[PDB]
Amino acid sequence: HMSFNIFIASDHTGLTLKKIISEHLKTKQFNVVDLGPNYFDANDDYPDFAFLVADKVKKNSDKDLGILICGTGVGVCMAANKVKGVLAALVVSEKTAALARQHDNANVLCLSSRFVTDSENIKIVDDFLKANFEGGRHQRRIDKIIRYEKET
Ligand SMILES: O=C(CO)[C@H](O)[C@H](O)COP(=O)(O)O
C-alpha cells in the first residue's frame, strides 16, 4: 500500500535475498527502501544495518515496517528490539509468519539467510504482510512491552 514504507537491510550474508525481496515487493506496488549494504563486505556488522531499519520504523511505528536479514535472524532481532517502539519477530517458517503479525503485532520481520531458502523467505514475507494484528488479548500483552520500555 502507498500509505507506508517498508525498510529493508541485511548484513553481508543476505544481499541476494534482500534484492529478491525488495524487487518482489516493488512489483506488488509496496513502497520499499533498501538501506543497504549495496555491495559485499565479508566482515560487515549486522547491528549497523539493524539500527538503520529499526530507527526508521521507530519514527512511524504504527505504519512503517522493517525487514532484516542475517545468517540466522537472531542478531538483527536482538538489535532491532532495542529500539523504542520496535517489535521485531524472527520467523524461519511459513508456519509462524502470520502469527508474528496476528499475535505479536511485529513491525520488523527478521529472516535467516543461511538456514531458510529464498522461496520460503518470500512466502514468510508475503504471509507476514497479508496478516493483520488480531488485537484483544494480544493488545493487552503488547501494551505491557511498550509500557516497560517507556517507563524503565
Ligand atoms: O547470523 C548472524 C547474526 O545472528 C550473522 O549474519 C553472522 O553471525 C555472521 O557470521 P560471519 O561473520 O561468519 O559471516
Helix, strand, coil percent values for the chain (each to nearest 5): 50, 15, 35
Measured by CA distance, the residue closest to atom 3 of ligand 1 is 75
Ligand 1 centroid–CA 140 distance in Å is: 34
Q: 103 catalytic, yes or no?
A: yes
The coordinates were experimentally obtained by X-ray
CATH 3.40.50.2300 fits 1-152, yes or no: no
Resolution of the PDB structure in angstroms: 1.1
Can you state the angle between helices 94-102 and 118-130, rounded to 10 degrees?
30
Measured by CA distance, the residue closest to atom 1 of ligand 1 is 71
Which residues make Cβ contacts (< 8 Å) with residue 74, sequence separation at least 6? 90, 110
Best residue for ligand 1 mutational test, from 46, 68, 78, 81 (most atoms within 8 Å of Cβ): 46
Place of cell 521507530: 58
Locate the ligand 1 atom nearest the alpha carbon of residue 14 and give its number: 6
Starting at the earlier edge strand, list the strands of the sheet with 31-34. Answer: 31-34, 5-10, 65-70, 108-112, 88-90
Other CB atoms within a 10 A radius of the CB of residue 96 amount to 16
Q: 77 catalytic, yes or no?
A: no
Residue 37, preceding peptide bond in cis (omega within 30° of 0): yes
Can you state the angle between helices 118-130 and 15-27, rounded to 10 degrees?
40
